[PDB]
Amino acid sequence: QTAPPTTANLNAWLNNFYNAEAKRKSTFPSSLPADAQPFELLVINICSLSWSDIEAAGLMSHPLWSHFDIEFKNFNSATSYSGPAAIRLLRASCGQTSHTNLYQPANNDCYLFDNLSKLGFTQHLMMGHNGQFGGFLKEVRENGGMQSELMDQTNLPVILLGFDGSPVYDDTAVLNRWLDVTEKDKNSRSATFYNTLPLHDGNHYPGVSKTADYKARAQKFFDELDAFFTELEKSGRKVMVVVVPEHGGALKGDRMQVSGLRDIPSPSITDVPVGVKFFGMKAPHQGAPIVIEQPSSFLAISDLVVRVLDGKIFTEDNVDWKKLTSGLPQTAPVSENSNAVVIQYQDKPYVRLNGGDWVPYPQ
């Protein structure tokens, strides 16, 4: 990023970014080693949660945030819409593509959960909703490659209704069912993709008309997730949980995009907290979370999963935490929706709307 920030130079930079990203892959082994230790992977993909939202709600000190072993502080969601965010996470094992290329085929080895299934992990798909709104489940299947049947939702308590009137299931009940389904799946190892949207602004209680209280809803969700973590620790089960918000809820707006709007994938909307917690270790992590400050995105999640595949971390007495958390792949914070791109160039944000000229994102 030495050339002057003209439209031609920024377009050239972005196209070079795509070309460099296309050469990046998170490489999985052909088989697990003979002494591999089984564990469960659970990826919790959450709608409408960014660092900016947590600060706006006054919840930066909720115990959940210190209940991780690794925390990414500059993770970029690369989009501000749910469907694209889920596709990008499901395609975590290859470098970042343009928005248009999310809807074109990718190499089979780009699909994180297929890479895990090929190594003997049972794949599970679980949702706190039915995925009909916005064609979300359809995109997860067609572009995210996720063909697993939806985990049974029958008899789960319903906390709210979504904007379209369909159920929003209670996260505590969903997660407790996950414990049971994984116990009963005949496999010692599994990988689950869980998408949940309790903070979505259109969720409501039928007949009430009260405006949603984001802080109260976020407090309840964080309380439920933290309680699930505490119970999972006491269970002795070997689990890797990755908490990955899709994108922010846009609680705080700015000069160019007012609060609530997500058409432009602004830095505050795409800068999301990503946390990893390990359960059932012989030597559980003791301090505050290890912080990864470098610019990161989904490729770093895939590479961390590769590093843990053999399960040795769960039986090691002296874990080299630095080895585990160092040298992960870095990714520039480029974000796209269908007709908007945001980049950082010479430490300043720029935006391109409708394929026109680049303009500074006003600050």
Residue 33 burial (CB < 10 Å; 0-12/13-18/19+)?
exposed
List, as one string, the DSSP characters of 81-135: SHHHHHHHHHTTTB----TGGGGS---GGG-HHHHHHTTTPEEEEEESS---GGG
Binding string, residues 270-299; x marks residues near Zn ion by CB under 5 A = ------------------------------
Site string for Zn ion, 197-236 (x = CB under 5 A): ----------------------------------------
Q: Give the residue with the Cβ less far from Zn ion, 48 or 190.
A: 48
187 binds Mg ion (CB under 5 A): yes
Residue 52 contact among Zn ion, Mg ion, none, beta carbon within 5 to 8 Å by kind: none
**Helix (H) and strand (E) counts in the chain:** 10, 13
Radius of gyration of the chain (CA): 20
Indicate which single residue of 82, 93, 297, 331 sits in contact with Zn ion (rule: CB under 5 A): 82
Query: Which of the choices Zn ion, Mg ion, none does residue 185 contact, using the CB cut-off of 5 to 8 A by kind?
Result: Mg ion
State in angstroms the smallest separation of the CB of 68 from Mg ion: 24
Helix orientation angle between 298-308 and 82-90, rounded to the nearest 10 degrees: 30
Pick between residue 185 and residue 316 the one whose CB is nearest to Mg ion.
185
**From the CB of 328, what's the least distance to Zn ion, in Å?**
25
Residue 182 near which of Mg ion, Zn ion, none (CB within 5-8 Å, type-dependent): Mg ion
Short-list 249, 274, 343, 305, CA closest to 14: 343
Decide whether 183 or 316 has the Cβ nearer to Mg ion: 183
* Structure tokens given for 22: 């296309």
Q: Which is nearer to Zn ion, 248 or 280 (CB)?
A: 248
Distance in angstroms (rounded) separating the CA atoms of residues 284 and 319: 9
Q: Is 293 exposed, middle or buried (0-12, 13-18, 19+ CB in 10 A)?
A: exposed
Contact criterion met (CB below 8 Å) for 358 and 5: yes
Q: State the nearest-atom distance from the C-beta of 123 to Mg ion, in Å.
A: 12
82 contact, one of Mg ion, Zn ion, none, CB 5-8 Å limit per kind: Zn ion
246 binds Zn ion (CB under 5 A): yes
By CB under 5 A, tell whether 92 contacts Zn ion.
Answer: no
Binding region for Zn ion (CB under 5 A) out of 37-45, 240-248, 251-259, 278-286? 240-248
Shortest distance (Å) from residue 88 CB to Zn ion: 12
The yes or no reply on residue 54 touching Zn ion (CB under 5 A) is: no
Asked if 172 and 224 count as a contact pair (C-beta separation under 8 A), the reply is yes
For the CB of residue 350, give the shortest distance to Zn ion in the complex, in Å.
24
Helix (H) / strand (E) element for 244: namely strand 239-245
Q: Which residue has the tokens 């705080």?
A: 252
Of 93, 182, 257, 296, the one binding Mg ion by CB under 5 A: 182
Distance CA 308, CA 116 (A): 12
Nearest of 241, 245, 232, 304 to residue 43 by alpha carbon: 241
* Closest of 87, 85, 88, 93 to residue 110, by C-alpha: 93
What's the closest the beta carbon of residue 238 comes to Mg ion, in angstroms? 11
Which secondary structure element, helix H or strand E, spans residue 195, and what is its range?
A: strand 190-196
Interface pick for Mg ion out of 55, 152, 185, 213 (rule CB under 5 A): 185
- Count of residues near Mg ion by CB under 5 A: 3
**Shortest CB 247 distance to Zn ion, Å:** 6
Q: Which of 43, 44, 47, 313 binds Zn ion (CB under 5 A)?
A: 47
Q: Is 235 in the site for Mg ion (CB under 5 A)?
A: no
Which positions touch Mg ion (CB under 5 A)?
182, 185, 187
Which positions touch Zn ion (CB under 5 A)?
47, 82, 246
